[PDB]
RNA sequence: ACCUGGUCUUGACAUCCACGGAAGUUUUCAGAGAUGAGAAUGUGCGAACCGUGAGACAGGUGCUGCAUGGCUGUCGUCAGCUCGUGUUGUGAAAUGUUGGGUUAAGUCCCGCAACGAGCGCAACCCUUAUCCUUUGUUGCCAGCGGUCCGGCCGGGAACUCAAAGGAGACUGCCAGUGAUAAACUGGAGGAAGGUGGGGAUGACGUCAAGUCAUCAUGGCCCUUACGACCAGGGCUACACACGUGCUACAAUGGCGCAUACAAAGAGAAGCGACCUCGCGAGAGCAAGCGGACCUCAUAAAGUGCGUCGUAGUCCGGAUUGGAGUCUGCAACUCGACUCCAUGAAGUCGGAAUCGCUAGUAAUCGUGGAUCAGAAUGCCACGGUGAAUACGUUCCCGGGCCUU
């Protein structure tokens, strides 16, 4: 049947449902090469198949919301992840062993008062 | 079909109004929609806490607004004269939409 | 250094609010300044009542005020009559119809705000600044609080330079959010200038 | 602020109103894109008689409580120091100090 | 500048004194505050003493002054210079 | 730090090679976090790299940082009078670390077209010891060679 | 709040009394206006509301922050600061609070003439990272069924999400180490591991620190004036010196075309679509929206293709001329923005000096408060996304013991 996972990165959330194929992938009736030019972002989504094996035995249809480039390409990789755990859950250790079932879970620093940024001063004189 | 939508500065109180808007309808005929938990707005503020200069010293406020829709479809007579006479706690915001 | 407003920090913690009505922008900063003409109006109608804490709701096109107190024979009067009295000026002021309901303060020794303003006017009577401040913190002690601290700041005495005291029994722990800290303040107006008074009174953490 | 420094935005907004619709079709004629160019010129001229204190431009929002003119904030009609006051007194519905 | 579509502005009570004297040979100097006026094409030739903030300075309106405004010819800083 | 709490960030492999020393050199060029930027000018002075040699892309690019590779370097060491510039070894780590900031650094100096281009000709010197970048490596080994003597401290 | 001139004196703002008058509307002249003189119309429902006349008084952003309250900065989010009883000392004082370990921590354990307690630390609060339950529109589209291919429609409650209630992390588990202690080092499981990240939270006190111009207030001072009203000017001056920023000096770029991916927020005297007109800023017409619905509102960096080819340039965009738009009684002094033309310094900055340890710095856009109009400031939001930390001798600030 059908197997499910949501990943999250940064400000974006992407489904992705797995199933039985020959290597077909879909992001927001898009492809592939056609949703992601940077390669990096390209490389980031394979890495979950290339690790395991199952390159060209799935198919991939995946909708993503929010954040960019490298945030949508993360989140789909950790969703990816979790689809395929629910697939095969002897998967967990190898994967758990590449660091792609933790959630990143790093965010923007809010701005605070006081500073330029988050963390950036205003330039110091002593006189 | 009717729209109720609710307003609050508590999510507490907001509830309490919602849990009796959607008991006060279904027993008098009427079936429910909801509650919806639309999204809560917050409104920020920021001051300056000292009377003088010291620009970099200041409080930041909030004021947080919950909302919440009920949908009465098919609304029966004994259910509408049974809504306005309710009179819901103070500090809730009722609308009714047709 | 300066210390956050115990109230404001636990207003949505373990305190509630003042005021408890809801509006839009088009009539919020209305319905402020009616309060503030409201409460200014009881606050010195009433002023040998022991007023501890006056709540104002606005449930539909009408006001309903609460008036906590330790004396409310003194502020209903006979059969009501007084009570009535201010029903009619505050529906003046607010504009509305007016409703005014009496709550009872009991032991007035546990309550900041009796407690800032009982100090104070024995200071406008030339009491000693010290002897005050220890029967206050004696009194709450005795009445069961866990702790209470008292403040008192000016020209004690009429001393040329101004100074700060202040005494504290029990605990009065203000950084713990969950600890019900009843916290108000008032000033004298002697011959030598002001006086202000600052009373914590603790009541257990919740 | 001065009691009339305060005195003077109470006939301002007074005068603002008594004069409300009177100043709206005036400029409605200079406005007017297919009048005709002496009536917008007698409307200009018109314009400039009502007195000064009459247009909302002339206002400025002070502190209910205090009559500051610095520091105003439309949503509660106070300056930043009573806003602060009242909102630690619990006198502000839903008001709270914010963190996120 | 004022758009177009509303022409040149002028006090009213500056466009009275300015009618009262060209039908006339008032040659007297006309005593205005009016800075903002726009200088119209009918009074090249009198005086107008414009208000400069402390007293009234006379303008010889001719042609060429006509477009501008009457405080464009009564300065309102006085400034010799630092040390000089 | 004081307290010693520093532990390693891991870094992506580059796209193209697979290669985290090359991903490594992607980062030291990058400016203002455009690292696609800088991504691409890396791969074409690779390009011109590759074909200007027999090489593949890596082993020229190895080749380049084992001559801009330092071995020993000098560190203040102020003690009892005075201070003495120490010869120090350095770890395997931060030889790749200094070989590849003189070569961004040498190569932002000339003065050719692109950056593309003026990288690929760091990099051909590089391979034959010439330019900059090999050049500071040498300033740094002697150096360390006029201090031998305070090889102690 | 200042200046020049024009003006008022129980008074612009209160109360009291006397007397006049409903209050209001509608126009004329004089004057820069304040104001003065009128001239019409209403006279309703005492007491509203106006005018005048007296004197108690009002009024003061006038002085003193070294008379004060309140509020704030600061050492410093540093780990400290104390008290009761006991005991020691003629006494000031000491002990506790020191010691052995340990911790981010006066954190904890052990010892101990101390035994206990308080204020601080931590925890309780907000937020962010995982999951569950409920609810399913204005939000959602997996399987369906149609389709103008638009979740567009029928439906669907799965999913993303919205917001309520729960679950979760405790050095709990395992091993070693250690004084059979506190703890530490590492491993497992897990979204998260040792205070998970960020915020709020500021002990006793210090600087007679800041604020009498937010407000309040002792005292002092002015009262036909230091009070009040008006017009114009000033706060925008300019040999110069400093602080904080913005934009650059280019090719990791400029310009042209094409083409992706955000978050957060605001709106009724408001946000304003569509359409048409304008080179453009805008104009006319006019929907929708008190909003998960409508509007603001195209994110930009990015990517593809072309071009420019190292030049004071197709870099840079200061300055100035001309012509306009919009807000507003009114843009001369002194607004923002548009168009055409002009095309300054500047080619990486002396001594010196500042910020930052990770989603940080750097860089890229977006919003909001104030506000008729008027941000390169402030407050907030996401996109992209580094380098480096061997170590604690030195510089600066601080903590503990000792001399
Ligand atoms: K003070
Ligand atoms: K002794
Ligand atoms: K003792
Ligand atoms: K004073
Ligand atoms: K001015
Ligand atoms: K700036
Ligand atoms: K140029
Ligand atoms: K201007
Ligand atoms: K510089
Ligand atoms: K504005
Ligand atoms: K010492
Ligand atoms: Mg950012
Ligand atoms: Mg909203
Ligand atoms: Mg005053
Ligand atoms: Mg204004
Ligand atoms: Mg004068
Ligand atoms: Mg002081
Ligand atoms: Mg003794
Ligand atoms: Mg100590
Ligand atoms: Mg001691
Ligand atoms: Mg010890
Ligand atoms: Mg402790
Ligand atoms: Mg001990
Ligand atoms: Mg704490
Ligand atoms: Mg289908
Ligand atoms: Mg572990
Ligand atoms: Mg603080
Ligand atoms: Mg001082
Ligand atoms: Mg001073
Ligand atoms: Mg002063
Ligand atoms: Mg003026
Ligand atoms: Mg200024
Ligand atoms: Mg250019
Ligand atoms: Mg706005
Ligand atoms: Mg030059
Ligand atoms: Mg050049
Ligand atoms: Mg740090
Ligand atoms: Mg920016
Ligand atoms: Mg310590």
């Keep these: 049947n059908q197997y499910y996972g949501t990943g999250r990165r940064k400000s974006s959330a992407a489904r992705v449902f797995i199933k039985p194929g020959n290597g077909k992938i879909v992001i927001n009736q898009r492809s592939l090469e056609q949703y992601f030019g940077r390669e990096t972002a390209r490389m980031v989504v394979r890495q979950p198949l290339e690790l395991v094996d199952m390159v060209e035995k799935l198919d991939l249809y995946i909708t993503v919301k929010g954040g960019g480039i490298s945030g949508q390409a993360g989140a789909i990789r950790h969703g990816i992840t979790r689809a395929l755990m629910e697939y095969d859950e002897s998967l967990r250790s190898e994967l758990r062993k590449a660091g792609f079932v933790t959630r990143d879970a790093r965010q923007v620093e809010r701005k605070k008062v006081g500073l330029r940024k988050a963390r950036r001063r205003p330039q110091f004189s002593k006189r | 079909r009717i729209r109720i939508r609710l307003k609050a500065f508590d999510h507490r109180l907001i509830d309490q109004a919602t849990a009796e808007i959607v008991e006060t309808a279904k027993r008098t005929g009427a079936q429910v929609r909801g509650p919806i938990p639309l999204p809560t707005r917050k409104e920020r503020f920021t001051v300056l806490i000292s009377p003088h200069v010291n620009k970099d010293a200041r409080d930041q406020y909030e004021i947080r607004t919950h909302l919440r829709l009920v949908d009465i479809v098919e609304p029966t007579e004994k259910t509408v004269d049974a809504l306005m006479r309710l009179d819901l706690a103070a500090g809730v915001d009722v609308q009714i939409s047709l | 250094g300066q210390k956050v407003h115990p109230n404001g920090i636990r207003l949505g913690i373990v305190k509630p609010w003042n005021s408890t009505w809801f509006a839009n922008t088009k009539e919020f900063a209305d319905n402020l300044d009616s309060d503030f003409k409201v409460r200014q109006y009881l606050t010195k109608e009433l002023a040998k009542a022991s007023v501890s804490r006056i709540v104002i709701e606005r449930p539909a096109k009408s006001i309903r005020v609460t008036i906590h107190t330790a004396r409310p024979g003194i502020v209903i009067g006979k059969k009501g009559e007084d009570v009535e009295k201010l029903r009619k000026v505050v529906a003046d002021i607010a504009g509305v119809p007016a409703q005014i309901n009496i709550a009872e303060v009991r032991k007035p020794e546990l309550d900041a705000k009796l407690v800032a303003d009982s100090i104070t006017s024995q200071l406008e009577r030339r009491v000693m600044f010290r002897r005050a401040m220890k029967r206050a913190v004696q009194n709450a002690m005795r009445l069961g609080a866990k702790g209470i601290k008292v403040e008192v700041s000016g020209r004690l005495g009429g001393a040329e330079i101004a100074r700060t005291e202040w005494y504290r029994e029990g605990r009065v722990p203000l950084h713990t959010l969950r600890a019900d800290i009843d916290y108000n303040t008032s000033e004298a107006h002697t011959t030598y200038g002001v006086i202000g008074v600052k009373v914590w009174i603790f009541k257990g953490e919740i | ?100 | 500048p004022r758009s177009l579509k509303k022409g040149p502005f002028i006090d009213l009570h500056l466009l009275k004194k300015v009618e009262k004297a060209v039908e006339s040979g008032d040659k007297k100097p006309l005593r205005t505050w009016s800075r903002r006026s726009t200088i119209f094409p009918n009074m090249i030739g009198l005086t107008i003493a414009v208000h400069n903030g402390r007293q009234h300075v006379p303008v010889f309106v001719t042609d060429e002054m006509v477009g501008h405004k009457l405080g464009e010819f009564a300065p309102t800083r006085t400034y010799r210079g630092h040390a000089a | 730090p004081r307290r010693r709490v520093i532990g390693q960030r891991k870094i992506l492999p580059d796209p193209k090679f697979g290669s985290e020393l090359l991903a490594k050199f992607v980062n030291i060029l990058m400016v203002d976090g455009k690292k696609s930027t800088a991504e691409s000018i890396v791969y074409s002075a690779l390009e011109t790299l590759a074909q200007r040699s027999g090489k593949s892309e890596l082993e020229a690019f190895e080749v380049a940082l084992e001559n801009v590779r330092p071995t020993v370097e000098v560190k203040s060491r102020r003690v009892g009078g005075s201070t003495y510039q120490v010869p120090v070894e350095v770890r395997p780590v931060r030889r790749n670390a200094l070989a590849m900031r003189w070569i961004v650094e040498a190569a932002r100096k000339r003065g050719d077209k692109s950056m593309a281009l003026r990288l690929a000709n760091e990099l051909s010197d590089a391979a034959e010891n010439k330019g900059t970048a090999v050049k500071k490596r040498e300033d740094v080994h002697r150096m360390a060679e006029a201090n031998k003597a305070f090889a102690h401290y």
Excluded at chain 4, 18 to 42: G, M, P, Q
Aim: aromatic letters at 6%; charged letters at 35%; glycine letters at 4%.
């Design chain 4, 1 to 100: 602020a001065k009691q009339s420094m305060k005195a003077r935005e109470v006939k301002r907004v007074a005068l603002a109103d008594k004069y409300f619709a009177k100043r709206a079709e005036l400029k409605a004629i200079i406005s007017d894109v297919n009048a005709s160019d002496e009536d917008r010129w007698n409307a200009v001229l018109k314009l400039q008689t009502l007195p000064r204190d009459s247009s909302p431009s002339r206002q400025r929002n002070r502190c209910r409580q205090t009559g500051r003119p610095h520091g105003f904030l439309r949503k509660f009609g106070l300056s930043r120091i009573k806003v602060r006051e009242a909102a630690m007194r619990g006198e502000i519905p839903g008001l709270k100090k914010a963190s996120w």
